From a paper:
We show that scaffold assembly requires conserved leucine zipper (LZ) and Cnn-motif 2 (CM2) domains that co-assemble into a 2:2 complex in vitro. Purified CM2 forms a stable 2:2 tetramer with the purified LZ of the PReM domain, and we solve the crystal structure of the LZ:CM2 complex, revealing that helical dimers of LZ and CM2 interact in an anti-parallel fashion. Thus, Cnn molecules have an intrinsic ability to form large, LZ:CM2-interaction-dependent assemblies that are critical for mitotic centrosome assembly.
Intriguingly, all of the individual LZ substitutions, including L535E, perturbed the assembly of the apo-LZ-homo-tetramer, and strongly reduced the α helicity of the proteins. To better understand why the L535E substitution did not more strongly disrupt the LZ:CM2 interaction, we generated LZ-L535E:CM2 crystals and solved their structure. This presumably explains why the L535E mutation only relatively mildly perturbs LZ:CM2 assembly in vitro and Cnn scaffold assembly in vivo. Most strikingly, however, the L535E substitution could still form a detectable, although less robust, Cnn scaffold; this is in excellent agreement with our analysis of the behavior of the LZ-L535E:CM2 complex in vitro.
Residue numbers in the entry:
A (entry chain D): 494 to 544
B (entry chain B): 1081 to 1140
C (entry chain C): 496 to 544
D (entry chain A): 1079 to 1140
The structure:
């Protein structure tokens, strides 16, 4: 019968779920990259104060 | 009246002590001035670093 | 009669689980790094006195 | 009187003593300011060390 129809819908919702999860995951990685680089710069600065 | 030899000796000793104390004060004053200068530079750079971090946290 | 699609649809749902898992771990990381940057900026400010 | 001007060396000794008290006080005050500055800087450097260690500990655990 007609089981292909609803399954396509569920798979498209799953596609939107991968888009959202991967999108917010990459955004989080970009944040973590900026914060890590800033912490490294600041630690380097603090180290420069000990010379 | 005074003891002439005694006041000559004291004059020379006072001049010696005054020169030694002048040199000590000039050396200490220069060390403190350099320290104040270095600290001022440090505080300027610290301000710039604080600004960078608050800009980063703000962009989050 | 195909059957096999269950794995492929579940693999996609397993991919959502993996992405969400790494994302939540990343959120914990960002929280720790943010807190450390706030502490460190507070410390640097404390040096200005 | 003898080989010097007695009044002149009396005045010069008195002035040298005044200058020496003033210069001693300046040197002691400046030295105390320097000692306080060095102490505060030493404390700052200890705290800076602990902060660097905390940051590297965080970064390593990340
Ligand atoms: Zn005399």
């Amino acid at each position: 019968s007609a089981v292909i129809g609803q399954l396509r819908l569920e798979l498209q919702q799953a596609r939107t779920e991968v888009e959202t999860a991967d999108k917010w995951r990459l955004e989080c990685i970009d944040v973590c990259s900026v914060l890590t680089n800033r912490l490294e710069e600041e630690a380097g600065f603090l180290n420069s104060l000990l010379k | 009246s005074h003891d002439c030899a005694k006041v000559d000796l004291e004059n020379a000793e006072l001049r010696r002590k005054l020169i030694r104390t002048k040199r000590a004060f000039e050396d200490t004053y220069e060390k403190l001035r350099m320290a104040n200068k270095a600290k001022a530079q440090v505080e300027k750079d610290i301000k710039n670093q604080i600004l960078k971090t608050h800009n980063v946290l703000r962009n989050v």
